[PDB]
Design a protein around this ligand. Structure first.
Ligand SMILES: OC[C@H]1O[C@H](OC[C@H]2O[C@H](O)[C@H](O)[C@@H](O)[C@@H]2O)[C@H](O)[C@@H](O)[C@H]1O
Ligand SMILES: [Mg+2]
Ligand code: NA
Ligand code: NA
Ligand code: NA
Ligand code: NA
Ligand code: NA
Ligand code: NA
Length: 672
């Protein structure tokens, strides 16, 4: 009944900061170097005092080596602190059991994964193999069902314990396969790695994947952050219910934020924590990454995470008291641009492509996900009705939504689906339902929704819930002004259509528990990587598995009650995952976009670009780094490779010349 078209082209964005494209193998390689070096105080005060082993003995025989050619400013010098500001709060250190550490780069820096993809924003080539990280190399069998994966060899956790296949296997078996454990982020279900996929240990430094499909190369991306970031099994395994008398809740909570020096494969280790104030990390002396001159990374000795608000991160970065921000809330754009416009500004600000998007997601489970009551169930039935979805999207004045956030060329009309800023995007394949409130009102009337009590809100027919008013709950992340503003705008627009929408505003952790547990009717959410990049966590594009979709999961352990268009989307996604043909992949994403946007798998709210803000004293920041593409800029900028020239260094270290203490002990260790 609606006059659909394609979305109008947004205003031209002079998108400052162009990316310097490079080839995949210009960034790093694994190899032995003839000599290695580290900060002088480690050698003088720890090694020479017999308190820490010599550096060569702490490194793998073949460490990960960053190639100087890809370094924007070349080889670094030691020193200084990276000062981050975050809106989140740590629950504890058990990432693989689903605890948040506060976001804003903390878990990104702690939890290293098998592969790495965030720095791939600088590779234009199709289609790029994820960078090796904890997995140094891999080989496909001739038939394409077997993937032999070789691990970094001789690397150690920050506490000196060997990193090997046991850590990989513990994550796979006891975190992924185990249905009672859910790693942080809402993903990492077994089917995210392919239906029926198995993983086995060959030896201490070799694992073997077996896939049902032939060459499903897209799963290498799933082996990067957030889905395959192994934890220290020697510490975690004795707390797991399979190997102790602990319950799953006791395993999840065994490492509270106060527990210091949690072993990591990351560049820095947590050494201090003050509630609602600060987390301090110190350099990991067992870090397994070096530069081409043999200097053990990171260059920065310390990292701070000030516990504040997300809006304060922007404020502190432009003021110069914070060193980094992802300017991603349009309500903060004008004030930030004003401060950045001063030539004496301590920080540089640079917008990227339009990769920040928001969708309204409707719960499509009519078979019990989140155990809904009679009211909840009737909403799942409306959600699954295509005429209802068409009315909701048509009742949205998308120009007004964008203007409510910020004026100017930032926002773009966003019907939903793949972001307009990504290479797989096809405007002609994007179904746009223009603002048509009258048509939206007539469509709801056609499915039996009419105002029978004179209050302007539509009622169910007499047969459903005694003909009461339709009432829909809207789950919102209370940590962001943008999410709240979009939710408030959504309530207003729905009231004009005649639907009563009630906001359920929760902090990040509670919001995640309600979302992943399926305890929602509708929710407002900022897009994740599958919509900004397609290639990162591709399984999230459709219900390919019982728990891969953000808005259609099945209760444990029922099958999905998929609608025909969702089955079509799932088939396209599985075909894309196993394709190495560039023309076929591009065509499949055109088909995917059309099915998504025609059927309204989700309903787009708005889309706009974000800007990376970084203190000017840092060297090695890549030009044109986007705030979000394969992952957040905290990962993409490669913080372990950043450095500050000696004459520009800040004097901000809270534990200078100190190293992390033992897991569960007081805090850091000194030389005297
Ligand atoms: O982790 C870095 C990130 O932190 C904040 O975003 C948190 C959200 O992003 C995750 O990908 C996750 O899927 C969500 O649950 C989580 O809320 C911040 O807004 C970002 O700029 C960035 O620093
Ligand atoms: Mg071990
Ligand atoms: Na074979
Ligand atoms: Na194990
Ligand atoms: Na298995
Ligand atoms: Na239990
Ligand atoms: Na806290
Ligand atoms: Na993927």
């Amino acid at each position: 009944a609606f006059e659909t078209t394609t979305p109008p082209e947004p205003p031209q964005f002079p998108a400052e900061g162009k990316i310097n494209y490079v080839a995949r193998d210009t960034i790093l390689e694994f190899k032995a170097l003839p000599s290695y070096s580290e900060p002088d105080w480690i050698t003088e005060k720890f090694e020479k005092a017999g308190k820490l082993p010599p550096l060569k003995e702490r490194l793998p025989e073949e460490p990960l080596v960053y190639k100087t050619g890809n370094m924007p400013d070349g080889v670094g010098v030691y020193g200084d602190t990276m000062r981050h500001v975050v809106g989140g709060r740590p629950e504890g250190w058990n990432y693989i059991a689903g605890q948040s550490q506060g976001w804003g780069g903390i878990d990104i820096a702690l939890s290293e994964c098998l592969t790495r993809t965030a720095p791939l924003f600088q590779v234009d080539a199709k289609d790029t193999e994820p960078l090796p990280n904890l997995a140094k190399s891999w080989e496909w069998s001739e038939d394409g069902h077997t993937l032999t994966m070789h691990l970094v060899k001789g690397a150690k956790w920050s506490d000196g314990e060997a990193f090997n296949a046991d850590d990989v296997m513990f994550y796979w078996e006891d975190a992924v396969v185990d249905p009672n454990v859910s790693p942080l982020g809402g993903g990492a279900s077994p089917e995210a790695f392919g239906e029926g996929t198995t993983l086995k240990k060959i030896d201490d430094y070799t694992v073997e994947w077996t896939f049902k499909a032939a060459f499903p190369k897209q799963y290498l991306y799933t082996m990067a952050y957030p889905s395959f970031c192994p934890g220290p099994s020697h510490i975690l395994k004795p707390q797991h219910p399979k190997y102790s008398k602990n319950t799953y809740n006791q395993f999840k909570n065994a490492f509270p934020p106060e527990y210091m020096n949690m072993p990591v494969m990351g560049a820095w280790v947590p050494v201090s924590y003050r509630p609602d104030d600060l987390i301090v990390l110190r350099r990991n002396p067992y870090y397994w990454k070096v530069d081409e001159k043999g200097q053990q990374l990171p260059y920065l000795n310390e990292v701070h995470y000030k516990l504040s608000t997300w809006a304060d991160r922007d404020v502190q970065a432009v003021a110069g008291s914070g060193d980094f921000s992802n300017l991603e809330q349009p309500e903060n754009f004008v004030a930030s641009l004003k401060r950045a416009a001063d030539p004496n500004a301590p920080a540089r600000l640079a917008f990227g492509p339009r990769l920040i998007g928001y969708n309204l997601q409707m719960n499509f489970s009519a078979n019990g996900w989140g155990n809904p009551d009679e009211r909840g169930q009737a909403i799942r039935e409306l959600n699954r009705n295509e005429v209802f979805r068409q009315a909701v999207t048509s009742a949205l004045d998308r120009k007004a939504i964008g203007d409510s956030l910020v004026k100017g060329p930032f926002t773009a009309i966003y019907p939903g689906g793949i972001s307009s800023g990504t290479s797989f995007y096809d405007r002609a394949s994007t179904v746009y339902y223009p603002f048509n409130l009258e048509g939206a009102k007539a469509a709801l009337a056609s499915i039996g929704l009419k105002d029978t009590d004179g209050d302007g809100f539509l009622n169910f027919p007499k047969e459903t819930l005694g003909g009461r008013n339709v009432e829909i709950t809207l789950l919102v992340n209370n940590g962001y002004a943008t999410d709240k503003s979009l939710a408030e705008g959504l309530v207003g627009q729905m009231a004009k259509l005649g639907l009563r929408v009630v906001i359920h505003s929760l902090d990040s952790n509670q919001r995640d528990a309600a979302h992943y547990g399926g305890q929602f009717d509708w929710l407002v959410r900022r897009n994740s990587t599958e919509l900004s990049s397609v290639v990162q966590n591709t399984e999230q594009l459709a219900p390919v598995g019982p728990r891969t979709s953000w808005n259609h999961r099945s209760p444990e352990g029922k099958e999905l009650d998929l609608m025909p268009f969702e089955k079509e989307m799932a088939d396209i996604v599985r075909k894309f995952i196993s394709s190495q043909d560039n023309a076929e992949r591009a065509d499949l994403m055109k088909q995917y976009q059309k099915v998504y946007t025609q059927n309204l798998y989700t309903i787009g709210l708005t889309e706009y670009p974000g800007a990376l803000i970084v203190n000017k004293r840092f060297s090695n920041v890549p030009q044109g780094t986007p705030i979000f593409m394969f992952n957040w800029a905290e990962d993409a900028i490669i913080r372990e490779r950043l450095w500050v020239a000696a004459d520009k260094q800040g004097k901000y270290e809270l534990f200078p010349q100190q190293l992390p203490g033992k897991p569960g002990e007081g805090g850091p260790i000194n030389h005297h």
